Design a protein around this nucleic acid. Structure first.
Ligand SMILES: [K+]
Ligand SMILES: [K+]
Ligand SMILES: [Mg+2]
Ligand SMILES: [Mg+2]
Length: 135
RNA sequence: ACAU
DNA sequence: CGATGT
């Protein structure tokens, strides 16, 4: 129904899918960019979406913030819930870096706790998520 | 079908 | 139009 403005919003941006993947997190109320991941040469949209949420979890935990996270990715929200990124991307030399980060993100989820609500951004009702890359 |  | 996902 109502946007929770006191929140963190994350999104992926890519050049190709699979392709170059980046992500960022922003203050939903103001759009202030709070973190930005250096581009990863080969990844999928959903791996980036997943990494972005997990990074948000770690960012908020480190700052003792109870803010929820918005993501527009049904897939990544479920992957974080499951603590398991069920990506189809081939594991080979050129995808090594993204798979390393995904493995480490899962590993972090399996060794830490959090109460952060991970909420679906309702793009159809509210427009594009505030962390969108505008491509 | 829905979410990207 | 193509791809990644439930
Ligand atoms: K975009
Ligand atoms: K499809
Ligand atoms: Mg998105
Ligand atoms: Mg977007």
């Amino acid at each position: 129904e109502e946007i929770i403005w006191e929140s963190l919003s994350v999104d992926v941006g890519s050049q190709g899918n699979p392709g170059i993947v980046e992500y960022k997190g922003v203050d939903t109320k103001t759009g202030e960019v709070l973190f930005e991941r250096e581009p990863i040469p080969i990844g999928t949209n959903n791996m980036g979406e997943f990494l972005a949420i997990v990074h948000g979890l770690r960012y908020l935990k480190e700052r003792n913030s109870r803010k929820p996270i918005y993501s527009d990715s049904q897939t990544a929200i479920k992957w974080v819930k499951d603590k398991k990124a069920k990506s189809t991307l081939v594991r080979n030399e050129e995808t090594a870096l993204i798979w390393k980060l995904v493995d480490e993100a899962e590993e972090w989820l399996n060794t830490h706790t959090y109460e952060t609500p991970i909420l679906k951004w309702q793009t159809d009702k509210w427009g594009e998520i505030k962390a969108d890359y505008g491509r």
